[PDB]
Design a protein around this ligand. Structure first.
Ligand SMILES: CCCCCCCCCCCCCCCCCC(=O)OC[C@H](COP(=O)([O-])OCC(O)COP(=O)([O-])OC[C@@H](COC(=O)CCCCCCCCCCCCCCCCC)OC(=O)CCCCCCCCCCCCCCCCC)OC(=O)CCCCCCCCCCCCCCCCC
Ligand SMILES: CCCCCCCCCCCCCCCCCC(=O)OC[C@H](COP(=O)([O-])OCC(O)COP(=O)([O-])OC[C@@H](COC(=O)CCCCCCCCCCCCCCCCC)OC(=O)CCCCCCCCCCCCCCCCC)OC(=O)CCCCCCCCCCCCCCCCC
Ligand SMILES: CCCCCCCCCCCCCCCCCC(=O)OC[C@H](COP(=O)([O-])OCC[N+](C)(C)C)OC(=O)CCCCCCCCCCCCCCCCC
Ligand SMILES: COC1=C(OC)C(=O)C(C/C=C(\C)CC/C=C(/C)CC/C=C(\C)CC/C=C(\C)CC/C=C(\C)CC/C=C(/C)CC/C=C(\C)CCC=C(C)C)=C(C)C1=O
Ligand SMILES: COC1=C(OC)C(=O)C(C/C=C(\C)CC/C=C(\C)CC/C=C(\C)CC/C=C(\C)CC/C=C(\C)CC/C=C(\C)CC/C=C(\C)CCC=C(C)C)=C(C)C1=O
Ligand SMILES: COC1=C(OC)C(=O)C(C/C=C(\C)CC/C=C(\C)CC/C=C(\C)CC/C=C(\C)CC/C=C(\C)CC/C=C(\C)CC/C=C(\C)CCC=C(C)C)=C(C)C1=O
Ligand code: HEC
Ligand code: HEM
Ligand code: HEM
Ligand code: HEM
Ligand code: HEM
Ligand code: FES
Lengths: 326, 241, 95, 354, 354
């Protein structure tokens, strides 16, 4: 058995069962178990029609005393003494356990001891009235209770499988819809947040700029040079537009500017990331002072260590005097 | 001894399928900008929160551009000043709490970003507090700068009665009276606390109704399978077919 | 598991590893029994709820009425304390 | 482990006669998973340097971040409601009488949950959060230098928040492990039934009990979704949305509703240590309710008068916690404490024989 | 679970003829526990809003916080050294020939470890950390809108750090679970021996193998303590102590030493995607080395020429990664890649018959 414990102790305040039985101590004793009456063939008490007419019970409501929660039971775990009280079997008291072995109640006068002790087998004691009280169920479903014989559908009924699978299908249908909504919503939270999406769009008010002026906008962490180009600057890049293929990174000004008057570029030197300064260099474009890279008026590398042209960001013209970076 | 509990005002948004009343929210912001903003700050409310929810984008740009924000550093390491934009929070009247206390006789006007839900009674507390300014109870004398409000804990608040009839002119033409302004600002501050309030309830409506249909399906399934069990007949000395 | 007598198996076929718990709840049925049932697909699946409805609630309420006296006494205590609190506050503070 | 799943879900036998009160345990297991999942997701966005500004950021800026914020707060309330109802259920049927190992495994999860919920409340970083932990930590000021080691400073700061956050992240995972010891003992030590005795009417779990358990958990979900989206019950005190001020106390300093019972015990007893010890008594004393009995009976299915008085006693103590520290409430609360002690003694004491 | 421990530690039988190369696995398990423990403790003090200032705070202000900082960094180097040596060991004896399930369970832990180590490197929040993740994430720029979802912004920020931190906190715990599947398969599918065949010379683990394993792990500890306190080997690049500047790149952008092999593969191949695919090839191709063989033999205990060339090939590729992108290095590196492909084909191909 699993780890288990019983309260088989010698109490300081509660007597053992041999000393004070808590059950109704009237039993009938036979010589052989076959001499007991048969409950199934024994007439029971006459049925009553009112709950107030039901018979009385032999139990004593006040069998136990003292502080504690109320309880009615017949048995305890306490240990018995080696010299237990001698039971009065003549009056009907039960003799089983220590009160038989460690006493001389079993002794008759002239009967062979083997026969005398045979009678006090526990199978020979049954409570008075066992055969007239103990229920003998013939079924777990008493008469008047609903069962399959009353709920069976008529034989002309319609198939119930189709609707059953519709109901279990609907449980799955709704469950899958709730599952998809949950998953998508959680993944959606990883998208750039409302503050970040908002900050990732800067609008350039081309209103107030003067031809030849270069301004810087911090867009997505990087400097974005936005320069209005004078006709001289525009013509200069157009002149190099013919000498294309003589440049480290051949690109035409038309493919780097959406409007000739406006050059929007990311101001990050393609060599080692330094930010170039405008109106500097040999081409009057943008000169990175770190290692000496010269870019033209279109942002194309013309001299220095830098390998490529300054990148053109993603930007569109909302109107004639506004750009939207992103 | 706990502060008097506010009454239950019948705001539109209290019902299960009701939204924030946008026209009232618009009027509420006007009250906050022109009355409450002088002493209080809304640190966690940004102009972009109002775009396409309370006001159109162009209008919110004008509101933000009205204020000036210290920004920087520039290339010379100096801090400059610029007009506001959609990314800025609502302006703060004072640079720090010590400055606020000094200008308000040692009382600190709390930030109103979450005050709509920070008191027992919630939105009702704001509406009741603004309209809860009565003459002092007989036998109670208040030191100068303290006023009697039935709902403020203790009864004496360092806030002057902020709402007076005709204080502002509503753009929509609604009559400007103290009770109207209290109702509107209470509405607006409730929105500011949880701008996703309408989204929560609309999605909740779909979930709750769907959950009822889901309950019916599992109930039919539960009834079906347990019929096998609850109608069985176990016999011992009897047999019926 | 059940008692040793109950779970003592008659067959010598080994207990499958996926039915260990199932066979620890075995019972040794004395005297035999006849079990009968019908598939739910051929039965009324909601009528039993309606048939048993009134008796179910009658027996539920009569059992719960045992707690009537205790609950009234606790409620009587709730009222005394609430109004003992009001009188105390007024006596100590109100004029 | 597909043969272990099949032995504990598919071919697991349970009595047919159980009520819906036997579905509570399943609900605890499911909502517990949700609380762990939503916590992990919330930490993808949360700021531990300022919990006050993190919650605002999640509610306003994160897409559907309000769902995560409110589910985590409201589902914690549901975790305690369901767990406490499970405790009341176990007390009513006296399931601890023979399945004490199940009761012991459960109590460990109760002890862990108490710590988990409290620290999480602190992570909000509002007025009540700061002042609640300040008050509770002072209870151990008797032990020298213990407060300094725990707080990491001379006052509660972000230093304390950082370390408590790790306990809040990890302890719930350990709680899930203890749930496996709880289920192991339930499956080995068979569950109790509505009747006292053991009867031969068991049916497999997956086809019958799981369908009934889903019906119950979907019914509780219909209620939880209403609270989640509309706040039909006030289950979070509003004072925790006020920014912390270490010089000014809030109007009242109280924990969540599910700690009110223990909060009132401290507020009632005059000596601080006695209050702490009575708190220890209530949770520990219910672990030995049946240990002194000597009769062959589990005291099951009587009128359960003592049980009902105890449940109402918890409710009344919770009610007293909400009220201000009025003298009259203190007197009545003390009577309730004395009354509770007598009820427990009734449980413990064995009976003599007439 | 004391009878499961007794069946897998006390009465677990292993051959007597194994070398100290069979002690590597035990070392991995122990150092893995240490890395998890020191990580949890470090997070009691770490600041995720600025990883750069958190490390300084731990090293200077926390009592014995330098031990936590250096153990976690240096023990990660030891985790990869021991794991790679274990991989080399398995390749040499061709333990994958019959114990493929053990090889598969191990490779999963290898894949997880790669992710764990890389994200942790980012948590330092230095120049190399910022620029390393920026470069690697651009490899998946082909998949639309995937970079934005992962980074949470248009550039790497604290938003990215917060989410990567959760993966770094949780994934190592999952790795420990996979270690149980690895040990389950080792105990069921018996280990290989230095000889090809299976022989009757096994002895219990606790009294003999564990003593020998402790001797090995204590010998490795004498070496790890010297590195831990005195930095006898440069295992962390100094460039990660520079504050992040998003406009200026560092002198070189390289990962830790244990990622150099894969770093060079990308730097060598001209097309970016081809570089990624060759990285995929190297780890996956070694999972099917024995699948096409048809003879009754495990190719064990020959002169292992192909093996030795492969190990040196890993070392040379690691060497090329350190060097600048010089054209001459690119040419030689490409030859090594071609050479490596031929070696793998030698492993895979079955033999015809003369
Ligand atoms: C300056 C101050 C300094 C203070 C210094 C204090 C130092 C104290 C040192 C203490 C050292 C530790 C002692 C631990 C002992 C552990 C023993 C144990 O585990 O045994 C298990 C052992 C297991 O035995 P078993 O064989 O397995 O089972 C036995 C069977 O069940 C059946 O056995 P049986 O049938 O043979 O029966 C034997 C009988 C034997 O029983 C006895 O002999 C015990 C009698 C105890 C009586 C206590 C009465 C106190 C009344 C105070 C009145 C104050 C009046 C003030 C007047 C003021 C006027 C102005 O037992 C019973 O009848 C049932 C016992 C039930 C025990 C329940 C245990 C509950 C413990 C917790 C209670 C308190 C918590 C709630 C309240 C907290 C807040 C207030 O149990 C026993 O053998 C029985 C022992 C029972 C001991 C109970 C002792 C309770 C003492 C309470 C003290 C209260 C003090 C109040 C002071 C107020 C002043 C105003
Ligand atoms: C462990 C414990 C448990 C843990 C759980 C986890 C907990 C975690 C913590 C919690 C975390 C926080 C988050 C919690 C969130 C909780 C709440 C939540 O999730 O809420 C979600 C969600 C909340 O709402 P919501 O998400 O805002 O709503 C979203 C929208 O509703 C709908 O969404 P939407 O608007 O985004 O998308 C709509 C769109 C979505 O659109 C689609 O997806 C449709 C498109 C799919 C296309 C599929 C194509 C597949 C085939 C591809 C091709 C294959 C070729 C293969 C060839 C192979 C060859 C070898 O669909 C439509 O627009 C509909 C029309 C679609 C037309 C499709 C036409 C297809 C044409 C195809 C033509 C092809 C021809 C080709 C020919 C040429 C070939 C060469 O919940 C619900 O809505 C609940 C709904 C429940 C069900 C309601 C229905 C009840 C029905 C009752 C029936 C019974 C009554 C019967 C009455 C009968 C009267 C007689
Ligand atoms: C406020 C809190 C949030 C509330 C809203 C969100 C809640 C989300 C809850 C999701 C529940 C999903 C349940 C789906 C059920 C579908 C199957 C079903 O029951 O159908 C009935 C049917 C049963 O019907 P049947 O048994 O009658 O089938 C008979 C079969 N025929 C008709 C062919 C004869 O089940 C199936 O079809 C079989 C599927 C079994 C499923 C077992 C495993 C479940 C795994 C669930 C996946 C969870 C994923 C989690 C991912 C999370 C990521 C973040
Ligand atoms: C130690 O761990 C444990 C806990 O945590 C500490 C528990 O909470 C619990 C119990 C948990 C619960 C009962 C669930 C959560 C409990 C609560 C109280 C949260 C909700 C809060 C409340 C209901 C507070 C309001 C309380 C009150 C108004 C009670 C005060 C009034 C009282 C007592 C008078 C009412 C008396 C009653 C007997 C109630 C019913 C009365 C009636 C039906 C009749 C009314 C009378 C008439 C004449 C009509 C247990 C078992 C536990 O073990
Ligand atoms: C002031 O107002 C009041 C409140 O509001 C403020 C109240 O809430 C309350 C009631 C509050 C409560 C009853 C709970 C209060 C909770 C507090 C103070 C929590 C404080 C934080 C902690 C205890 C965190 C430390 C964590 C632990 C000790 C772990 C707890 C769990 C335990 C011990 C169970 C078993 C142990 C574990 C699970 C630990 C496992 C250990 C490991 C895995 C270590 C492994 C190590 C190795 C080397 C292998 C009152 C009374 C009140 O008055
Ligand atoms: C640029 O310079 C370079 C470097 O330095 C910068 C390099 O390091 C390198 C080499 C670097 C590498 C080889 C590694 C790079 C690592 C990176 C980019 C890691 C990025 C972060 C992630 C992948 C985190 C996401 C995490 C995952 C997908 C989990 C990973 C583990 C997996 C998939 C194994 C099995 C799955 C799991 C363990 C997940 C478990 C899932 C659950 C428990 C979910 C449960 C959910 C429910 C609902 C129950 C190169 C080539 C280089 O060029
Ligand atoms: C415009 C109509 C408003 C609104 C809606 C509120 N106020 Fe004030 N307020 C001021 C000060 C000094 C305080 C501190 C509290 C006190 O004085 O002791 C407050 C407080 C508030 C609250 C919180 C009340 C409490 O519980 O603390 C609220 C909700 C509130 N106010 C709303 C000062 C001023 C002003 C300076 C003259 C003005 C103007 C306003 N408040 C205006 C408003
Ligand atoms: C039984 C499990 C848990 C319960 C009872 C619980 C409880 C709570 C509580 C009550 C809150 C604060 C509510 C509020 O802000 O007012 C909270 C916050 C938080 N919890 Fe949990 N939690 C649990 C598990 C977890 C887990 C597993 C994680 C992480 C993996 C987590 C992470 C967080 C975080 C980040 C916060 C701060 C967000 C906040 O302000 O709510 N929690 N927790
Ligand atoms: C994390 C919290 C816990 C969870 C996950 C949980 C889960 C479970 C589940 C699934 C069952 C089996 C089905 C059921 O009876 O409903 C159960 C049974 C039980 N639990 Fe818990 N439990 C928790 C807390 C507790 C606590 C705190 C106690 C004790 C105070 C407890 C005591 C019991 C008992 C006695 C049973 C036996 C039920 C019976 O015999 O019928 N549980 N629990
Ligand atoms: C195989 C397991 C793991 C390995 C390979 C690993 C690797 C590393 C690496 C290389 C670092 C950065 C080293 C440096 O700063 O230069 C790091 C940092 C960190 N790791 Fe881990 N880690 C692992 C497990 C964990 C775990 C389980 C946790 C937490 C429970 C954790 C928490 C941290 C934290 C907070 C940091 C930041 C401190 C730092 O700057 O070093 N790690 N990790
Ligand atoms: C977290 C990393 C891992 C740990 C904890 C670990 C641990 C172990 C241990 C304890 C053993 C048994 C004793 C030994 O042979 O030394 C072993 C065996 C083995 N491992 Fe791993 N391992 C890891 C990684 C790997 C990887 C990545 C592979 C495959 C590429 C692998 C393949 C094997 C093989 C084939 C064996 C069989 C050894 C034999 O047959 O003699 N392991 N491992
Ligand atoms: S970074 Fe510009 S010249 Fe080198």
């Amino acid at each position: 058995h699993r780890p288990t414990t019983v309260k088989m102790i010698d109490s300081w305040r509660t007597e053992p069962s041999s000393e004070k039985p808590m059950w109704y101590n009237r039993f009938d004793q036979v010589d052989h178990i076959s001499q007991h009456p048969d409950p199934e063939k024994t007439e029971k008490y006459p049925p009553v029609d009112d709950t107030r007419k039901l018979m009385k019970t032999r139990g004593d409501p006040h069998i136990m005393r003292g502080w504690g929660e109320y309880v009615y039971c017949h048995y305890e775990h306490l240990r018995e003494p080696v010299f237990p009280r001698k039971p009065d079997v003549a009056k009907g008291e039960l003799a089983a356990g220590a009160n038989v072995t460690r006493t001389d109640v079993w002794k008759r006068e002239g009967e062979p001891a083997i026969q005398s002790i045979a009678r006090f087998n526990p199978d020979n004691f049954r409570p008075v009235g066992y055969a007239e009280n103990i229920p003998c169920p013939d079924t777990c479903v008493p008469e008047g209770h609903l069962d399959f014989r009353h709920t069976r559908l008529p034989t002309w009924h319609a198939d119930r499988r189709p609707f059953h699978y519709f109901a279990t299908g609907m449980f799955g249908l709704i469950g899958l819809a709730f599952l998809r909504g949950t998953v998508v919503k959680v993944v959606h939270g990883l998208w750039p947040a409302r503050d970040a999406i908002a900050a990732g769009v800067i609008e350039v008010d081309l209103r107030g700029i003067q031809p030849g002026q270069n301004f810087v906008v911090k867009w997505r962490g990087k400097p974005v040079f936005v320069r209005r180009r004078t006709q001289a600057m525009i013509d200069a890049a157009t002149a190099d537009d013919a000498i294309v293929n003589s440049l480290r990174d051949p690109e035409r000004d038309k493919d780097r500017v959406k409007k000739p008057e406006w050059l929007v570029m990311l101001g990050v030197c393609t060599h080692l990331g330094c930010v170039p300064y405008p109106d500097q260099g040999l081409y009057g474009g943008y000169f990175c002072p770190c290692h000496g890279s010269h870019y033209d008026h279109s942002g194309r590398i013309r001299l220095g260590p830098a390998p490529l042209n300054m990148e053109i960001p993603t930007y569109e013209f909302t109107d004639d005097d506004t750009i939207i970076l992103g | 001894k706990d502060p008097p509990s506010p009454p239950d005002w019948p705001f539109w948004f209290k019902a299960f399928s009701h939204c924030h009343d946008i026209p009232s929210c618009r009027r509420g912001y006007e009250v906050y900008r022109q009355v409450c903003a002088t002493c209080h700050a809304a640190r966690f409310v940004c102009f972009r929160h109002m775009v396409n929810t309370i006001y159109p984008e162009n209008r919110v740009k004008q509101l933000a551009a009205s204020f000036d924000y210290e920004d920087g550093p520039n290339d010379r390491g100096e801090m400059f000043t610029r007009p506001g934009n959609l990314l800025d929070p609502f302006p703060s009247p004072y640079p720090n709490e010590e400055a606020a206390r000094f200008a308000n006789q040692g009382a600190s006007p709390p930030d109103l970003s979450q005050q709509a839900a920070a008191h027992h009674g919630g939105c009702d507390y704001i509406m009741s507090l603004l309209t809860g300014y009565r003459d002092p109870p007989a036998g109670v004398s208040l030191r100068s700068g303290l006023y009697y409000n039935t709902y403020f804990p203790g009864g004496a608040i360092s806030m002057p009665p902020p709402l007076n009839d005709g204080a502002i002119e509503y753009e929509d033409g609604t009559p400007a009276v103290a009770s109207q302004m209290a109702k509107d600002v209470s509405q607006f501050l409730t929105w500011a606390q949880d701008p996703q309030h309408d989204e929560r309830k609309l999605i909740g409506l779909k979930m709750s109704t769907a959950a009822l249909v889901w309950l019916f399906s599992i109930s039919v399934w539960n009834r079906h399978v347990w019929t096998m069990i609850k109608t069985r007949r176990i016999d011992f000395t009897k047999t019926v077919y | 598991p059940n008692t040793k007598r109950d779970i003592r198996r008659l067959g010598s076929y080994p207990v499958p590893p996926e039915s260990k718990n199932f066979w620890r709840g075995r019972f040794q049925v004395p005297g035999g029994q006849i079990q009968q049932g019908v598939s739910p697909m051929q039965q009324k699946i909601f009528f039993q709820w309606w048939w048993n409805l009134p008796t179910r609630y009658f027996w539920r309420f009569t059992k719960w009425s045992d707690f009537l006296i205790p609950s009234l006494m606790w409620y009587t205590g709730f009222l005394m304390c609430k109004n003992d609190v009001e009188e105390g506050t007024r006596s100590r503070y109100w004029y | 482990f597909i043969l272990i799943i099949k032995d504990n879900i598919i071919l697991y036998n349970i009595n047919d006669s159980i009520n819906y009160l036997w579905n509570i345990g399943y609900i605890i297991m499911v909502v517990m998973i949700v609380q762990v999942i939503t916590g992990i997701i919330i930490n993808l966005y949360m700021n531990i340097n300022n919990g006050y500004k993190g919650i605002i950021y999640i509610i306003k800026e994160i897409y559907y971040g309000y769902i995560l914020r409110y589910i985590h707060n409201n589902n914690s309330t549901l975790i305690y409601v369901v767990v406490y109802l499970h405790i009341i259920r176990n007390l009513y049927y006296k399931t601890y009488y023979y399945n004490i190992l199940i009761w012991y495994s459960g109590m460990i999860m109760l002890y862990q949950l108490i710590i988990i919920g409290f620290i999480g409340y602190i992570l909000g970083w509002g007025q009540l959060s700061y002042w609640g932990i300040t008050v509770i930590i002072n209870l151990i000021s008797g032990i020298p230098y213990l407060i300094l080691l725990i707080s990491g400073n001379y006052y509660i700061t972000i230093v304390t928040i950082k370390r408590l956050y790790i306990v809040h992240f990890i302890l719930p995972i350990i709680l899930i492990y203890v749930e496996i010891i709880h289920v192991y003992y339930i499956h080995y030590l068979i569950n109790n039934n509505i009747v006292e005795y053991n009867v031969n009417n068991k049916i497999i779990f997956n086809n019958y009990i799981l369908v009934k358990d889903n019906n119950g958990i979907i019914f509780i979900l219909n209620i939880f979704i209403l609270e989640l989206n509309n706040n039909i019950f006030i289950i979070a005190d509003n004072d925790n949305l006020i920014e912390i001020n270490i010089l000014v106390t809030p109007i009242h300093i109280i924990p969540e509703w599910y700690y009110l019972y223990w909060y009132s015990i401290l507020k009632l007893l005059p000596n601080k240590y006695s209050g702490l010890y009575i708190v220890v008594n209530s949770i520990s004393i219910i672990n030995i309710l049946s240990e002194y009995k000597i009769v062959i009976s589990e005291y099951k299915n009587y009128k359960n008068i003592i049980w009902y008085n105890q449940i109402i006693q918890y409710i009344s103590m919770i009610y007293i916690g909400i009220q201000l520290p009025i003298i009259e409430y203190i007197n009545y609360g003390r009577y309730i404490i004395i009354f509770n002690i007598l009820l427990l003694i009734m449980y413990l004491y064995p009976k003599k024989k007439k």
